[PDB]
């Protein structure tokens, strides 16, 4: 249902070049790297399995990149061209193409329109920045596990923000103080965390 994440599907945080944590983070999911050590656990903790450079982390990373490539290759159903803002919108299922840096200030609503099989793929050509206390919400049967944020460079999740979905970034994912995620942080470089909660979702 949407992009196949393969062995990456159980990970809350996956980054080849490490996960660097500050504060009382809780990862409800697996965590891995391709060999780089993680730092800041404790005081962080994970409730799933740690996979630092084993067969699972190699296959999970490869699968995360396969999904990134497939996500970028999809034909857009909605061309948003140079639109810079996501906040204050209600989006039905689609592949949404954004050509430049996007921000989310306020609330974004993902409307399943009564169909739980609804898929969202956000094709963000460069950066994603979510603002402080921003939120993504699900209505009318939308499922977090069917939402994909395909971030063309790096994602910055703002302080005390809330995100639903699978963040598949080409490079860095930074979750600022208190950001919460129902989904996953699948980075192409590093993940930085500060007092976050990440909970992996199923569909």
Author numbering: 1 to 203
Quoted passage from the original study:
Here we present new structural data for an IBP identified from a cold-tolerant fungus, Antarctomyces psychrotrophicus (AnpIBP). The structure of AnpIBP consists of a 45-Å-long β-helical fold with a triangular cross section. The main constituents are 6-ladder β-helical loops, which are supported by a long α-helix located along the β-helical axis. The AnpIBP uniquely binds to the water molecules that participate in the primary and secondary prism planes, which were detected as a prism ring in the FIPA experiment.
An asymmetric unit contains six AnpIBP molecules. The final model of AnpIBP shows the structural coordinates of 203 out of 216 amino acid residues. The crystal structure shows that D55, whose original residue is N55 modified with a glycan, is located at the C-terminal end of the long α-helix and is far distant from the B-face containing the IBS. Among the six AnpIBPs, half of the IBSs were covered by another protein, whereas the other half was exposed to the solvent. When we identified the water molecules whose oxygen atoms are proximal to each other within 3.5 Å to be connected with a hydrogen bond, a total of 88 water molecules were displayed on the solvent-exposed IBS. The molecules are mainly organized into polygonal arrangements similarly to those observed in Maxi, which extend over the left and right sides of the IBS in AnpIBP. There are at least 13 polygons on the IBS of AnpIBP, which are mainly located around S153 and T156. The presence of four regularly arrayed hollows was identified in the IBS of AnpIBP. The distance between the first and second hollows and between the third and fourth hollows is 4.6 Å, and that between the first and third hollows and between the second and fourth hollows is 14.7 Å. These intervals perfectly match the oxygen atom distance in the primary and secondary prism planes (4.6 and 14.7 Å) as well as that comprising the prism ring.
